[PDB]
Scaffold this active site. Structure first.
Site, PDB file in Angstrom:
ATOM      1  N   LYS B  32       0.863  -1.178   0.000  1.00 46.99           N
ATOM      2  CA  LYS B  32       0.000   0.000   0.000  1.00 46.99           C
ATOM      3  C   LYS B  32       0.903   1.233   0.000  1.00 46.99           C
ATOM      4  CE  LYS B  32      -3.956  -0.378   2.164  1.00 46.99           C
ATOM      5  NZ  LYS B  32      -5.191  -0.298   2.980  1.00 46.99           N
ATOM      6  N   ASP B 125     -15.744   0.092   8.491  1.00 46.58           N
ATOM      7  CA  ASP B 125     -15.840   0.001   7.042  1.00 46.58           C
ATOM      8  C   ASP B 125     -15.962  -1.461   6.598  1.00 46.58           C
ATOM      9  OD1 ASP B 125     -16.010   1.518   4.567  1.00 46.58           O
ATOM     10  OD2 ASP B 125     -13.920   0.929   4.108  1.00 46.58           O
TER      11      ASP B 125
HETATM   12  C1  YNK Z   1      -9.659  -8.548  -6.487  1.00 49.18           C
HETATM   13  C2  YNK Z   1      -8.747  -9.196  -5.451  1.00 49.18           C
HETATM   14  C3  YNK Z   1      -9.120 -10.667  -5.312  1.00 49.18           C
HETATM   15  C4  YNK Z   1      -7.308  -9.085  -5.964  1.00 49.18           C
HETATM   16  C5  YNK Z   1      -6.310  -9.418  -4.926  1.00 49.18           C
HETATM   17  C6  YNK Z   1      -6.522  -8.616  -3.701  1.00 49.18           C
HETATM   18  N1  YNK Z   1      -5.543  -9.060  -2.702  1.00 49.18           N
HETATM   19  C7  YNK Z   1      -5.179  -8.215  -1.589  1.00 49.18           C
HETATM   20  N2  YNK Z   1      -4.376  -8.713  -0.685  1.00 49.18           N
HETATM   21  C8  YNK Z   1      -4.055  -7.935   0.354  1.00 49.18           C
HETATM   22  C9  YNK Z   1      -4.555  -6.640   0.502  1.00 49.18           C
HETATM   23  C10 YNK Z   1      -4.153  -5.815   1.728  1.00 49.18           C
HETATM   24  F1  YNK Z   1      -5.127  -5.729   2.677  1.00 49.18           F
HETATM   25  F2  YNK Z   1      -3.122  -6.453   2.306  1.00 49.18           F
HETATM   26  F3  YNK Z   1      -3.792  -4.553   1.413  1.00 49.18           F
HETATM   27  C11 YNK Z   1      -5.391  -6.183  -0.504  1.00 49.18           C
HETATM   28  C12 YNK Z   1      -6.086  -4.829  -0.543  1.00 49.18           C
HETATM   29  C13 YNK Z   1      -6.549  -4.109   0.533  1.00 49.18           C
HETATM   30  N3  YNK Z   1      -7.154  -3.023   0.101  1.00 49.18           N
HETATM   31  C14 YNK Z   1      -7.124  -2.996  -1.244  1.00 49.18           C
HETATM   32  C15 YNK Z   1      -7.643  -2.015  -2.133  1.00 49.18           C
HETATM   33  P1  YNK Z   1      -8.531  -0.531  -1.423  1.00 49.18           P
HETATM   34  C16 YNK Z   1     -10.035  -1.258  -0.596  1.00 49.18           C
HETATM   35  C17 YNK Z   1      -7.360   0.424  -0.332  1.00 49.18           C
HETATM   36  O1  YNK Z   1      -9.025   0.322  -2.494  1.00 49.18           O
HETATM   37  C18 YNK Z   1      -7.515  -2.231  -3.489  1.00 49.18           C
HETATM   38  C19 YNK Z   1      -8.057  -1.208  -4.472  1.00 49.18           C
HETATM   39  N4  YNK Z   1      -8.473  -0.424  -5.171  1.00 49.18           N
HETATM   40  C20 YNK Z   1      -6.846  -3.382  -3.958  1.00 49.18           C
HETATM   41  C21 YNK Z   1      -6.325  -4.337  -3.078  1.00 49.18           C
HETATM   42  C22 YNK Z   1      -6.470  -4.124  -1.689  1.00 49.18           C
HETATM   43  N5  YNK Z   1      -5.687  -6.998  -1.490  1.00 49.18           N
HETATM   44  C23 YNK Z   1      -7.930  -8.843  -3.148  1.00 49.18           C
HETATM   45  N6  YNK Z   1      -8.955  -8.504  -4.154  1.00 49.18           N
END
Ligand code: YNK
Ligand code: NA
Ligand code: NA
EC number: 2.7.11.22
Lengths: 258, 292
Positions: B32, B125
């Site tokens: 992030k 959220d």
């Molecule tokens: C569509 C999928 C299956 C594809 C992989 C994704 N795998 C993942 N693994 C860890 C995290 C974590 F939690 F580790 F970051 C996150 C994540 C958390 N907030 C996110 C966002 P936000 C809600 C900040 O906008 C966006 C946007 N756009 C994109 C990803 C994340 N995602 C999950 N969904």
């Protein structure tokens, strides 16, 4: 009585041990002193009043400052900058509407620049490893106030008052955990106003007897007795207002008579 | 860094997320990048997310692995999760999600929430795309940027909270105080969404949202929610709809499920079930472990 009240209290009791500053840190500081810390905290009280910030924000800032000064050497010329950044971080953590940085610079009187304040934020976060969710005397007081069968708005403000006074004097109050100071504060407030004592219901919750609280009480009694004489007066001033029921004007008891 | 950008996952207001590889250890992570771009230095949401996540070590809460902080750059390194609830529901839109897996996912989610609440954290959220699933069958609460440490007792906190479709009525009707109950509403909506594969209450505005709720749960009055008619944003002209039968709202659910779901969706936040009490509900007497 809300959900998880006993769980949260147990958690807070674990975290207050881990979040404690080094008791003897001011001795190891080449340039600053308990007296200089007092001036800082007192000033932070005035900042809280001007910007209508919560009691909690002030108690957190102080916890951040003390943990920071446990690790880093600071020259007196830079001590106020540590407090400004601590107050900014505490505000970000706890307030709905935190002052902006430009306003923190204003309240210092341009002693420092926007640049310095932001950078000090960076350094405080590093030093604290981003661990900002510390238990405060405040959090323990609000826990204890639920155990007042008749809730007394004057006992509550006075307990808060005494807790705020403990933030000023590093000696002796770094010796004590927030939960014990709060215990002391609540009893002293209760006794002063109504003549009652540390309830049997709080003995059970905390495991602290009136007897186990005696050291902190002897100190807090003294602080209360000599509060009109203390160099720093922002807290006595604050607790004159109608908001806190003018509790700072109550005469303390001569005899604790535990 | 020691990180290789593998794939872009999405841009938010909060910032940019990449799938990445540790080039030395091979570990796959989600990075992030916090949108600093910053009049006020580090965003409150970033400060809350790190400080509260550093304290929350639980199987059903996302693992924060590391924080990389310079000037004009802040990265959060999380464990990478293969899928999310939003995506799994879509790939189940016809087949269905088997009830025992639904039950397992809800059990886990309540376990994470109970842990948060018992560590004085409100999530604020909850929604399907914040509920991430790994290959081992774990589902975890993620995205704690809108979370907050809360007091015993509570005071007034931020009003603009929770995505519309998952927002508890006490927030829509502008109560001074809200607490752990708003997270339970959110989970009730999601439980119902897993069962039917459709959003329970998809409003397109605040009023439309209230009305979707009222159409289904009945319009609340002094009888089922004392104080409600006194509230800021309550109007006496509200249409007086009747509570629908839950056998119709969520057909696949047994007696035990309905009972739990209705307890998560009580109007009065005081009557509404806690995460901890919900774990002891008969609905979960036969729940099974996470399995890949
Ligand atoms: C569509 C999928 C299956 C594809 C992989 C994704 N795998 C993942 N693994 C860890 C995290 C974590 F939690 F580790 F970051 C996150 C994540 C958390 N907030 C996110 C966002 P936000 C809600 C900040 O906008 C966006 C946007 N756009 C994109 C990803 C994340 N995602 C999950 N969904
Ligand atoms: Na010194
Ligand atoms: Na309590």
């Amino acid at each position: 009585v809300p959900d998880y009240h006993e769980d949260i209290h147990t958690y807070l009791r674990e975290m207050e041990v881990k979040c404690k500053p080094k008791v003897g840190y001011m001795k190891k500081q080449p340039d600053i002193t308990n007296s200089m810390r007092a001036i800082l905290v007192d000033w932070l009280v005035e900042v809280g009043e001007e910007y209508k910030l919560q009691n909690e924000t002030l108690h957190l800032a102080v916890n951040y400052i003390d943990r920071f000064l446990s690790s880093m050497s600071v020259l007196r010329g830079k001590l106020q900058l540590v407090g400004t950044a601590a107050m900014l971080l505490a505000s970000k953590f706890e307030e709905i509407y935190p002052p902006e940085v430009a306003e923190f610079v204003y309240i210092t009187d341009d002693t420092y620049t926007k640049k310095q304040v932001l950078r000090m934020e960076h350094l405080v976060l590093k030093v604290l490893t981003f661990d900002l969710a510390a238990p405060t005397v405040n959090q323990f007081l609000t826990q204890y106030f639920l155990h007042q069968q008749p809730a007394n708005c004057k006992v509550e403000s006075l307990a808060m008052f005494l807790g705020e006074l403990s933030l000023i004097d590093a000696d002796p109050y770094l010796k004590y955990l927030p939960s014990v100071i709060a215990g002391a504060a609540f009893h002293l407030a209760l006794y002063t106003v109504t003549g009652q004592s540390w309830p049997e219901s709080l003995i059970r919750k905390t495991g602290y007897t009136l007897e186990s609280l005696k050291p902190c009480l002897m100190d807090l009694h003294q602080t209360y007795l000599k509060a009109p004489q203390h160099a720093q007066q922002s807290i006595r001033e604050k607790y004159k207002n109608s908001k806190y029921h003018g509790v700072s004007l109550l005469n303390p008891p001569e005899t604790l008579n535990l | 860094e020691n990180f290789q950008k593998v794939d872009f996952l999405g841009e938010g207001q909060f910032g940019v997320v990449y799938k990445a590889r540790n080039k030395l250890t091979g570990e796959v992570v989600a990075l992030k990048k916090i949108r600093l771009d910053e009049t006020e230095g580090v965003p409150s949401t970033a400060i809350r997310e790190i400080s509260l996540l550093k304290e929350l070590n639980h199987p059903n809460i996302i693992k924060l692995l590391d924080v990389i902080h310079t000037e004009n750059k802040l990265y959060l390194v999380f464990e990478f999760m293969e899928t999310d609830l939003e995506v799994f529901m879509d790939a189940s839109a016809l087949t269905g999600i088997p009830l025992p897996l639904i039950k397992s996912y809800l059990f886990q989610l309540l376990q994470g929430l109970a842990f948060c609440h018992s560590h004085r954290v409100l999530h604020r959220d909850l929604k399907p795309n914040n509920l991430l699933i790994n290959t081992e069958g774990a589902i975890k609460l993620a995205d704690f940027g809108l979370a907050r440490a809360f007091g015993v007792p509570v005071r007034t906190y931020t009003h603009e909270v929770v995505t519309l479709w998952y927002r508890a009525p006490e927030i829509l009707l502008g109560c001074k105080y809200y607490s752990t109950a708003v997270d339970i509403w959110s989970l009730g909506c999601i439980f119902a969404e897993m069962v039917t594969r459709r959003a329970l209450f998809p409003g397109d505005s605040e009023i439309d949202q209230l009305f979707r709720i009222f159409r289904t749960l009945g319009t609340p009055d002094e009888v089922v929610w004392p104080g409600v008619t006194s509230m800021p944003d309550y109007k006496p002209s509200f249409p007086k709809w009747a509570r629908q039968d839950f056998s119709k709202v969520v057909p696949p659910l047994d007696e035990d499920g309905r009972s739990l779901l209705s307890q998560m969706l009580h109007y009065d936040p005081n009557k509404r079930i806690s995460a901890k009490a919900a774990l002891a509900h008969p609905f979960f007497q036969d729940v099974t472990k996470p399995v890949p």
